Amino acid sequence: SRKESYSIYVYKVLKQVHPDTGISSKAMGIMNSFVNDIFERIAGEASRLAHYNKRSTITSREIQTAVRLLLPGELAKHAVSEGTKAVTKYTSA
Amino acid sequence: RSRKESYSIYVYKVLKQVHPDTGISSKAMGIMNSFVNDIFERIAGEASRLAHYNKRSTITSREIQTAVRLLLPGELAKHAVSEGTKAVTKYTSA
Amino acid sequence: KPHRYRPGTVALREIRRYQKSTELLIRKLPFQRLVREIAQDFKTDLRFQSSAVMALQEACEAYLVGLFEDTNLCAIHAKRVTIMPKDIQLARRIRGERA
Amino acid sequence: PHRYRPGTVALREIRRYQKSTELLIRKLPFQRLVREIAQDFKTDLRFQSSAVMALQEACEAYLVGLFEDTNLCAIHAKRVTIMPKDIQLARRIRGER
Amino acid sequence: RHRKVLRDNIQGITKPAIRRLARRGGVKRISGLIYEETRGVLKVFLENVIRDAVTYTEHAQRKTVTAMDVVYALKRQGRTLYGFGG
Amino acid sequence: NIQGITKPAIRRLARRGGVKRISGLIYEETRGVLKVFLENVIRDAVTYTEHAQRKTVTAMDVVYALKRQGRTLYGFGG
Amino acid sequence: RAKAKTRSSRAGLQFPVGRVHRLLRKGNYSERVGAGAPVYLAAVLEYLTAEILELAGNAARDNKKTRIIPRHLQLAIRNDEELNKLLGRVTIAQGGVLPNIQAVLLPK
Amino acid sequence: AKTRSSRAGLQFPVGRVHRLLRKGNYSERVGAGAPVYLAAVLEYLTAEILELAGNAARDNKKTRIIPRHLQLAIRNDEELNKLLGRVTIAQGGVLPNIQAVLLPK
DNA sequence: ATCAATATCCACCTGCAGATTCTACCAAAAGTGTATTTGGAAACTGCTCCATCAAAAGGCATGTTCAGCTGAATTCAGCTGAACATGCCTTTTGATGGAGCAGTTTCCAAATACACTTTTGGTAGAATCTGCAGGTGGATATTGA
DNA sequence: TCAATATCCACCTGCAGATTCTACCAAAAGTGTATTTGGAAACTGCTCCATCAAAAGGCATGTTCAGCTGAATTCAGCTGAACATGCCTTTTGATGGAGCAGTTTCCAAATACACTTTTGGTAGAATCTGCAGGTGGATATTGAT
Ligand SMILES: [Cl-]
Ligand SMILES: [Cl-]
Ligand SMILES: [Cl-]
Ligand SMILES: [Cl-]
Ligand SMILES: [Mn+2]
Ligand SMILES: [Mn+2]
Ligand SMILES: [Mn+2]
Ligand SMILES: [Mn+2]
Ligand SMILES: [Mn+2]
Ligand SMILES: [Mn+2]
Ligand SMILES: [Mn+2]
Ligand SMILES: [Mn+2]
Ligand SMILES: [Mn+2]
Ligand SMILES: [Mn+2]
Ligand SMILES: [Mn+2]
């Protein structure tokens, strides 16, 4: 059948920071868990945020407030910039 | 004036059933509403998760039942499960 | 003589008394001031529903009381009867509030 | 005809095991304990091998963690030897009791 | 239209109030240094809750922190509070 | 079977946890905790199993149970 | 048409089956919600609020009051092993704590 | 036709993140930027950990990142450690650490 | 083995702040007649899970010393509790202006629902390559002297 | 400080379990269309939040004093560590059969829709009442003698 994971993406990102480094299967498994967990945490909080404010749509504004409430200081700042950077670029050309 | 819903009416009925003589202050009623909203959240939440882990797009009394077994401790679970089932078979008897 | 209760007697009198009651133990106004200060340092020109301040005080006191229970167990465990900073620190480290 | 003094080899093991990552509980005994307990909730169950490993990993990460808090409680009481009393206090403060 | 400057309000949590809280917590004897550690611990507790609460206030584009903001802020921190649900 | 969890294995766990000296009563104490930990988790897992109407406990069932018990594990499907 | 029977009375319940059904649909828990789900949930909630009101009511009586207040809710909850666990991470405003002094602290 | 990831300039699957938000029962509707934003956040955190674990590997004379390395990067970083404080990395062990009072001499 | 000094426990009042019951309007359950979809059901089909075997070989169970740790006993400097005198500043009430929550409508810009067209990611064999696990030899760290 | 025993630490080395590649099909993701509709303005009606004034007494503050608690010093009885000895339970594969997840292929039952019609609930109003707050006598409790 088929089982989709974030492997190829984690791997792509791996090569950009450490072109020389590889990653074992057990480690790739750990990165998957990591991505799924953070995904759930952010989505889940954005879900509550929209519900508290009686909105039926989760916009980038909810994902951002969620990131702020979820990630520690510097991680939040950097994550917030990367996020608005990606949305900005996506909205242009 | 956007009316605000609550479970007070039902908490009060149930109260009269167990303690006919007893009343309840508004603060205590405030706590009871929080309690009902909290447990609903926990159960539906777990039910939601449960249905998702099994590629099921609908939450049935069966999801609510497993949620209940997972969330409530021992005896409390046994009894809540009985009342739940009893209510469903009765409801289905039209 | 005058009469003098021995040290510890009044303290036990106080435990029974406060564990019997449910009122907040920190003064209202000072606490409201502390909230507005901390808040102000995060974002300016904020306002607070009266309920919000009370919700915060209820939460802080429930938290300190609970922390002192744990702190008290740590002191006793060290065969003492006087809670010290190191006890509060041991409790928070084990509560994972800060390993 | 020589011996290491009490505690010297203990420290040596702390160093060895804090450096490694292998599971410290023997596998078979563990699998056996797992199935015995499960058997009480539902009879005739089968286990993916990876389900047993996930359990052993969690279980060992939990005990190692619990021993840290216990070591801290024992040191708190001016001891260097952990005791049931220390595991009890740690589990009490963690709210597991 | 100037409100006075807010400073040192943490000292508003007095020695007597902390002694009372320890009492309810069942503490019999209190070291002289407990009071400053306690204020420090309270300060951290409060900031994290207020920070999260104010984050919910802003996302709702309000200038007023409501009791619900605090309730969500506390629930986020696994410190669920009953009695102010609205 | 709980006795299968042996003294030396408990010593090792203790060691990775940085414990230098161990009292004789800790061993039996540890099995009790180990047993409560496993019971609470396995019970939750089998409940996810029985719900999915299976007879096989899957790594995911364990991962979901662990998450519920506040012991999130990475490496087995989440 | 036919007689209007509430789903609650149909289930032999006090708690609002309809209200609970809408909350499930609007709470984003799943794409679809079965008919028995809100009936089963309304019953569990009702059973639970009946269990703690039974116990609270007793604490009220013990303290010679006829009106249940927050402290009464605290006593009922913390004194019941099962409810205490269910609500182990919940704080009840104006509930205080249970009277409890460690033995070692009492006068020798 | 070019993917939304490339357009957003990401390595993470924007399309998949969008489908996952819609099917995860989080809200009734999903804005177009939310998948973009979310994917960026996930990519960034992913790079942060791989960067430090890569380093942990190098400091070990290893070129392949393994579980132990992810554990050393995480627990040795204040922020990452706090974020994953209730998470356990299988096969990652613990940081070498012996309480002073337990040393000899 | 009292007594005296206080703190605590109770039952008796009763008007005020709240709680409970009385009244009406909707917002929202309940009814019905379609239109759609879910997921329970046999029947199969591999995947991977138990058994069953064997060796070996670690790794564990036993006993023997005894090192050095924990816990019992003592001692006492001075910290922290109890009691007091003072008088500050939190509480308790009321009143007022007006910032800013909601509560209404009005209307795109942005999201959903479709029908296709095109690309990418998950698979199942290929084609290496990072170290695990030994070897050996060289200082180390411990320990007994 | 010596001198010996047992630990570590290095630098190399070579096979092998994983890894990294290479070669193809379908779901997913990207498009071009047609509809929908969430919730962003643009007001504005009213809560209820911030402030001010004033008076009064509950409580915080700052001291004196000395009880008894935490902390430092000994001491020795045992517990728990280090080890050499001896043995069996765990580990490692390989085979084989079978149980049982995953699917495919239906369709009758169960849900979602659309919208009309029928009330249970909720926002005050009006009416009704526990019990907070006071106040003196038991009933104790505590601590000196
Ligand atoms: Cl200290
Ligand atoms: Cl013990
Ligand atoms: Cl159902
Ligand atoms: Cl968006
Ligand atoms: Mn400031
Ligand atoms: Mn205005
Ligand atoms: Mn491709
Ligand atoms: Mn090597
Ligand atoms: Mn609209
Ligand atoms: Mn003064
Ligand atoms: Mn003296
Ligand atoms: Mn002492
Ligand atoms: Mn001796
Ligand atoms: Mn009616
Ligand atoms: Mn009274």
User: Would you state the structure tokens that stand for residue G66, as one six-digit string?
Assistant: 């006829």
DSSP letters along F3-14, please?
Answer: GGS-HHHHHHHH
The answer to whether F43 and F35 have CB atoms below 8 angstroms apart is no
Nearest-10 Cα torsion for F26, F29, F33, F38: 100
Three-class SS state of D40: coil
Angle at G78 between CA G72 and CA G79, to 5 degrees: 85
Task: Tell which of F57, F61, F66, F67 to mutate to test the D interface (max D CBs under 10 Å).
Answer: F57
Return the structure tokens found at G44.
Answer: 């569990």
**Closest nucleotide over all strands to A6 (CA to C1'):** I121
Q: How far is the CA of G70 from the centre of ligand 15 (A)?
A: 17
Spatial separation of the C-alpha atoms in residues B9 and G15, rounded to whole Å:
9
Residue F30: CB atoms within 10 Å: 25
Q: Is A41 helix (H, G, I), strand (E, B) or coil?
A: helix
Q: What angle do helix axes E34-59 and C85-94 make, rounded to 10 degrees?
A: 40
Question: What Rg, from alpha-carbon coordinates, does chain E have?
Answer: 16
- Rounded Cα gap, residues E28 and G106, in angstroms: 9
C46: left (phi over 0), alpha (psi -120 to 50) or beta: beta
CB pair distance less than 8 Å for B48 and H25? yes
Backbone CA torsion sign across E50, E53, E55, E60: negative
Most G CBs within 10 Å, among B12, B37, B56, B61, to test the G interface: B61
E53/C52 Cβ within 8 A? yes
User: How many Cβ atoms are within 10 Å of G89's Cβ, its own excluded?
Assistant: 11
Q: Does B34 touch chain E (CB under 8 A)?
A: yes
- As a whole number of angstroms, the distance between CA G64 and CA G58 comes to 10
Among the listed residues G1, G42, G5, the one whose alpha carbon sits nearest the alpha carbon of residue G22? G42
Q: How many residues does chain B have?
A: 94
The DSSP bridge pattern shows strands E29-30 and G32-33 to be unpaired
Structure tokens, E85: 């649900």
CATH number for the domain spanning D74: value is: 1.10.20.10
User: What is the spatial distance between Cα E29 and Cα H41, in angstroms, rounded to a whole number?
Assistant: 50
Structure tokens at C73: 């167990």
Contacts of residue F25, Cβ cutoff 8 Å, sequence gap at least 6: D83, D84
Residues G100, A69: Cα–Cα separation, whole Å: 37
Is the distance from CB of G92 to CB of G73 less than 8 angstroms? yes
Method used experimentally: X-ray
Residue ranges of the domains in chain G?
A: 1-108
From the CB coordinates, do chains B and D have 3 or more pairs under 8 Å?
A: no
Fill in the DSSP letter of residue D42: S
Among all residues of chain D, which has the CA nearest to that of H98? D14
According to DSSP, the β-strands at G91-92 and E81-82 are parallel
C-alpha D30/C-alpha D12 separation (Å) is 26
Gap from D15 CA to chain H (nearest CA, Å): 7
Is the pair C, E in contact (3+ CB pairs within 8 Å)?
Answer: yes
Helix axes D27-38, D49-76, angle to 10 degrees: 100
Closest nt by CA–C1' to E30: I80
First to last CA, chain H: 71
Architecture of domain A1-93: Orthogonal Bundle (1.10)
Distance F49 CA to I43 C1' (A): 24
Which residues have a C–N gap over 2.5 Å right after them in chain H? Answer: none
The residue among C27, A67, E71 whose CA lies nearest residue H43 is A67
Distance from CA of G91 to the nearest CA of C (A): 7
Q: How far apart are CA D80 and CA D72, in angstroms?
A: 9
Residue of B nearest to G11 (CA): B91
Amino acid type, A87: V
Residue tagged 């089982």 (tokens): A3
* CB-neighbour burial class of residue F3 (10 A; exposed 0-12, middle 13-18, buried 19+): exposed
Q: Which domain holds residue D18?
A: 1-97
Residues in chain D, how many?
A: 97
Both tokens assigned to C38: 């901390």
How many beta-carbon pairs below 8 A join chains A and H? 185
Q: Does residue D55 contact residue F73 with C-beta atoms inside 8 Å?
A: no
Question: Both tokens of residue H98?
Answer: 């012996």
- Report the helix count and the strand count for chain A, using DSSP H and E: 4, 2
Tell me the nt nearest to G36, Cα to C1': J110
Packing angle between helix A25-52 and helix E67-76, nearest 10 degrees? Answer: 170
Q: What is the CA radius of gyration of chain B?
A: 16
C33 vs C24: CA distance, rounded Å: 16
* Contact exists between B and G (3 or more beta carbon pairs < 8 Å): yes
Residue found by looking up tokens 């069932």 in the block: F61
Q: Does residue B52 sit at the G interface (CB-CB below 8 Å)?
A: yes
Rounded CA-CA distance E57/C45 in Å is 12
- Tell me H77's DSSP state: S
CB G14 within 8 A of CB G46: yes
Selecting from A27, A57, A74 the residue whose C-beta is nearest the C-beta of H67 gives: A27
Residue H57's H or E segment, with its range, is helix H33-58
Q: How far apart are CA H83 and CA A42, in angstroms?
A: 12
Taking the CA of residue D90 and the C1' sugar atom of nucleotide I104, their distance in angstroms comes to 58
Instruction: Flag residues 21-80 of C with CB < 7 Å from strand J.
Output: 27, 47-51, 75, 80
* Segment (H or E) for D47: strand D46-47
Q: Strand ranges (DSSP E) for A1-93?
A: 22-23, 57-58
Domain ranges of chain A: 1-93
Task: Judge: C47–E83 Cβ closer than 8 Å, yes or no.
Answer: no
Nearest of E51, C81, H102 to residue A76 by alpha carbon: E51
Tokens of A78: 């950097």
DSSP designation for F69: T
Residues of chain H contacting D, Cβ within 8 Å: 67-68, 88, 90-99, 101-104
Closest C-alpha among H35, C21, C50 to residue A58 = H35
Residue E45 has, within 13 A of its CA and on its CB side, a CA count of 23
Q: What is the resolution of this structure in A?
A: 2.7
Distance, C-alpha D2 to centroid of its chain: 32
Instruction: Give the distance, in angstroms, between residue D4 CA and nucleotide J82 C1'.
Output: 7
CA distance A47 to A68: 14
Tokens of G22: 């809408």
| DSSP 8-state code for residue F76 | S
- Whether residue H82 contacts residue A42, with contact meaning beta carbons closer than 8 Å, is answered with no
Q: Does E59 touch chain A (CB under 8 A)?
A: yes
Q: What residues form DSSP beta bridges with C47?
A: E64
Report chain breaks in chain F, C–N > 2.5 Å, as residues after which they occur. none
The burial of C34, by beta-carbon neighbours within 10 Å (0-12 exposed, 13-18 middle, 19 or more buried), is given as buried
Sequence-distant (≥ 6) Cβ neighbours of residue H64 within 8 angstroms: A21, A22, A23, A24, H57
* SS3 sequence of chain G: CCCCCCHHHHHCCCCCHHHHHHHHHHCCCCCEECCHHHHHHHHHHHHHHHHHHHHHHHHHHHCCCCEECHHHHHHHHHHCHHHHHHCCCCEECCCCCCCCCCHHHCCC
Tokens of A12: 């792509």
User: Which domains occur in chain E, in start order?
Assistant: 1-86 (1.10.20.10)
CA distance D36 to D54: 17
Residue A34 tokens, joined:
């990591």
> Measured between alpha carbons, how far apart are the two ends of chain E, in Å?
32
CATH placement of domain G1-108 = 1.10.20.10
Q: Which fold has domain H1-105?
A: Histone, subunit A (1.10.20)
Which one of 1.10.3720.10, 3.30.70.3450, 1.10.760.10, 1.10.20.10 gives the CATH number of domain B1-94?
Answer: 1.10.20.10
3-state SS class at H39: helix
**Given CB atoms, is H33 within the 8 Å cutoff of chain A?**
yes
Distance, CA of G92 to CA of B93 (rounded, Å):
40
Contacts of D34 in chain F (CB under 8 A): 38, 42
Please identify residues in chain D, positions 62-81, with a C-beta within 7 angstroms of any atom of strand J: 81
Work out the angle between the directed axes of helices G36-62 and B8-18 (0-180°, nearest 10).
60
Provide the number of structural domains found in chain C: 1
CB contact under 8 A, F15 and D16: yes
